[PDB]
Design a protein around this nucleic acid. Sequence first.
RNA 1: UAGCGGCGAGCGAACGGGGAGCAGCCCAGAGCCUGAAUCAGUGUGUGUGUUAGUGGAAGCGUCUGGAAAGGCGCGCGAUACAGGGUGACAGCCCCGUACACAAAAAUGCACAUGCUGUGAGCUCGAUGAGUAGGGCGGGACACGUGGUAUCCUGUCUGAAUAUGGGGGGACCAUCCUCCAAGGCUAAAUACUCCUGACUGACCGAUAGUGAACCAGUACCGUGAGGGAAAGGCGAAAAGAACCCCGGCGAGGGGAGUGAAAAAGAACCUGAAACCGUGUACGUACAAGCAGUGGGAGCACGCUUAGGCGUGUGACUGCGUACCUUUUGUAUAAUGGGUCAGCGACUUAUAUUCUGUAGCAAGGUUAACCGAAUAGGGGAGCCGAAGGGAAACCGAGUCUUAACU
Lengths: 143, 64, 117, 201
Amino acid sequence: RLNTLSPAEGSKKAGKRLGRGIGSGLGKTGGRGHKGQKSRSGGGVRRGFEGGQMPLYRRLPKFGFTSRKAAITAEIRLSDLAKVEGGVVDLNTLKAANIIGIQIEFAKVILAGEVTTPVTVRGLRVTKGARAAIEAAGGKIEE
Amino acid sequence: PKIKTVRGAAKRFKKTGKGGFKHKHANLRHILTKKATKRKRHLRPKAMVSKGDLGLVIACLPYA
Amino acid sequence: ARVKRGVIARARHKKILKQAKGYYGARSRVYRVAFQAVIKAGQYAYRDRRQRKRQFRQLWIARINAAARQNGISYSKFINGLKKASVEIDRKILADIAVFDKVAFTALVEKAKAALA
Amino acid sequence: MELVLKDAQSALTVSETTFGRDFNEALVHQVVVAYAAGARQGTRAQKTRAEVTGSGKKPWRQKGTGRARSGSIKSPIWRSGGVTFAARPQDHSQKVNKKMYRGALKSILSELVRQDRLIVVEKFSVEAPKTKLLAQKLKDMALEDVLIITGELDENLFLAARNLHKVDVRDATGIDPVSLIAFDKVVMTADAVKQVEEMLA
RNA sequence: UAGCGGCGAGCGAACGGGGAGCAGCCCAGAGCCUGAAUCAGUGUGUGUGUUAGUGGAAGCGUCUGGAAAGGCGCGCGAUACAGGGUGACAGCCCCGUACACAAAAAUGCACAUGCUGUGAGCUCGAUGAGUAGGGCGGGACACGUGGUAUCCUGUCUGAAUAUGGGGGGACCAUCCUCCAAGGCUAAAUACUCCUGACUGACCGAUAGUGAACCAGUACCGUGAGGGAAAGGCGAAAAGAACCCCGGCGAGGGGAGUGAAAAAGAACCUGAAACCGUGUACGUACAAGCAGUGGGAGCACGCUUAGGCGUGUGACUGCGUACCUUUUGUAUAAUGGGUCAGCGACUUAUAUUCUGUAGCAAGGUUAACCGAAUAGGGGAGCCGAAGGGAAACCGAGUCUUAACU
Ligand SMILES: [Mg+2]
Ligand SMILES: [Mg+2]
Ligand SMILES: [Mg+2]
Ligand SMILES: [Mg+2]
Ligand SMILES: [Mg+2]
Ligand SMILES: [Mg+2]
Ligand SMILES: [Mg+2]
Ligand SMILES: [Mg+2]
Ligand SMILES: [Mg+2]
Ligand SMILES: [Mg+2]
Ligand SMILES: [Mg+2]
Ligand SMILES: [Mg+2]
Ligand SMILES: [Mg+2]
Ligand SMILES: [Mg+2]
Ligand SMILES: [Mg+2]
Ligand SMILES: [Mg+2]
Ligand SMILES: [Mg+2]
Ligand SMILES: [Mg+2]
Ligand SMILES: [Mg+2]
Ligand SMILES: [Mg+2]
Ligand SMILES: [Mg+2]
Ligand SMILES: [Mg+2]
Ligand SMILES: [Mg+2]
Ligand SMILES: [Mg+2]
Ligand SMILES: [Mg+2]
Ligand SMILES: [Mg+2]
Ligand SMILES: [Mg+2]
Ligand SMILES: [Mg+2]
Ligand SMILES: [Mg+2]
Ligand SMILES: [Mg+2]
Ligand SMILES: [Mg+2]
Ligand SMILES: [Mg+2]
Ligand SMILES: [Mg+2]
Ligand SMILES: [Mg+2]
Ligand SMILES: [Mg+2]
Ligand SMILES: [Mg+2]
Ligand SMILES: [Mg+2]
Ligand SMILES: [Mg+2]
Ligand SMILES: [Mg+2]
Ligand SMILES: [Mg+2]
């Protein structure tokens, strides 16, 4: 029987229709109020416009720059470190396992999660905690 | 279409770990001779955005 | 999916005009005038379901005053005597006794007087 | 799971997680609604205020006359052309998660098996494409309205009862939840059941 | 996103990755070698379309009915139950549909081949100057002259010639990579005046195209130009012979046709405002949003009630419309002559939150392919780690010579 399936309770609701009678609760002016710019079609002030007063994003100064090198430097999580699927942990091996990003030239091993495989790491910088974890798990780092 | 961020606010605010925003204090650009060293030292660090301004900051920065 | 209205709009107007029967002039012919007549009729009906109690109580009180003064006592003293007569519980609406059975009403008056005396 | 064969009174083994499990009514309802919306095409109409034949000339001057304020012959308020919120052709297809589709299908199959609307046989074909043969066989099997799915891709069977409305025949790969829920009873063929199991599961 | 920007409003890439599609060749010159490739333009042969077409299965009885296709009973076809018509809804009444066939004559698209023009390949050469670049003024590159690379040129100038020259975002050196100032080139891509078939949770005569109808018409304007209204008898005209009143009128009453004439041309259905005829009650000494509560009498259908219901409403208490805008409106503030029809919070794409469903440190695909709502595709995107302007460090990091 096809005419037997029904949606889960609370999964669907009608919503609201403005300007349909008094009983609906949104008649006449539908959630608009009386007069003013907030009413009317296409009304309302632009984004971040707090009146004619100088806005927050303009009364505060600028600072900093973009390194152009942080965008080419990833960090690998010590948790998995297994998607390499055998062999050593290399930059190209990480790229092959979709864990780093093709347009990446520097990676950090970091201490996050846990590792148990004794696989080694080559040509990657390792934090002190990550190094300790790898050596405890029986790995090796290409000093 | 995509929402276009306010580039003026993108270089004014930066997002923090718990969703807050950090910004640089004002009154530290010029005419600094008559300002107290205590005042300038307290202004030198960076502060967080207040409760009332978070709505405007988030509206300006949708992709931050 | 274009909705053509018509049938339901006619049904609502028919309902209102059916309720607006018996009214003079356009109040029973024109929907715009008739609709205002029905709402005012409802308002007046609501207010008078309340005013009815007051009107009938007033009529009963005047009635009891007339009968009690016929028997030789005012309404206030008659009510006070009935109240004091061993908390005798009788009724303002039951003042149809004063219309139908006169001897019963004078019997009531006799012990109202006795209680006051 | 064990499915009792019909033609040979034998038994066959199938995956429990596939052919038996709780029936997720909300999930199957979402998938069915999405499938129904998939067929729904657009092709709408109602040229709007701008693209209505006419002129930009103002019907009459702003002031000095007792008439209301008019600015265009194409106004939506006027008896002439003009529709406030016109309709453009649009797509109604939904996304439906890939795992959600398989889950809904598994639930449908489990419900069919549990309600005994699913039958399984070894072979099912007609030696000739005559509709009479298929009608006679279905009458003998007592199947007034049925969906038949196989993996053989038999053109003779396809031709037989090609337009017979109560009977539908389709390949094991072209199964859909709407057909599975619509047809009164479903008839499989050993090979088909394997192919589904190896797919759905 | 990087950037540009009265660094305001706003504008907005590229590198790189995944796909659709796959095609490379000539001149700046003659020696050989050859007439050789691959093309264009024309004949013939073969194949397949187009421009008329042919065949194309299977039902009877009975009831209601004006009429059977409907109900009841019993049969047959189906590679044909797409669709339309026929006196109400037909697989088997008709046209068709599935399927299988068909061209005298003229043409399209691919192949083979005859012939005309162009030519093949090898060695050796050559290698686009008022050009590149530059000064001045502009324009285009996401890039508004800014520290501004690169492209084009109105004006004035002006190189080198494989040992040479251009680029790599001011500029110099090293390195890498290409070879301007001569040309041609299919596919993937854009669109529909027009032709055929099919489709629609598109409209159904104030809708849909302006125009379902002899519509770009009537009509308006000197002209450019603007621009309507207007669909439906019945199955079949069987469209009312004949008689009567009437001006040998208009109009009507009979008769007749028809299932229906109250389907009669101004013809399906026939609502509302608005205007009439008849019946019941009230109304000519009574003052106002015309109702509402009480309520006599009168007139009509019933009852085991008489005083139950319906119509009217003498008399009587209370009672100054609606909407909008306002501190506040009976207000003498705005709007509405009335009826019918139409008429105003929508759609697309992004982003945040709530509910609900799937999956669970993972979730999910986009284009595209596809036996096309399946399956493949993980390019990507979000999350699991933050601090700092950044290098950088990292469950820590920043500040500071360093922090309790
Ligand atoms: Mg409210
Ligand atoms: Mg208003
Ligand atoms: Mg105001
Ligand atoms: Mg307001
Ligand atoms: Mg507007
Ligand atoms: Mg100002
Ligand atoms: Mg990736
Ligand atoms: Mg400074
Ligand atoms: Mg409709
Ligand atoms: Mg009436
Ligand atoms: Mg229109
Ligand atoms: Mg898919
Ligand atoms: Mg024929
Ligand atoms: Mg035939
Ligand atoms: Mg019959
Ligand atoms: Mg009929
Ligand atoms: Mg130049
Ligand atoms: Mg220059
Ligand atoms: Mg140059
Ligand atoms: Mg350069
Ligand atoms: Mg450089
Ligand atoms: Mg050159
Ligand atoms: Mg029209
Ligand atoms: Mg009509
Ligand atoms: Mg004229
Ligand atoms: Mg006549
Ligand atoms: Mg009809
Ligand atoms: Mg009529
Ligand atoms: Mg009428
Ligand atoms: Mg008098
Ligand atoms: Mg009188
Ligand atoms: Mg008067
Ligand atoms: Mg009064
Ligand atoms: Mg005022
Ligand atoms: Mg007042
Ligand atoms: Mg006043
Ligand atoms: Mg007024
Ligand atoms: Mg006004
Ligand atoms: Mg007025
Ligand atoms: Mg970080």
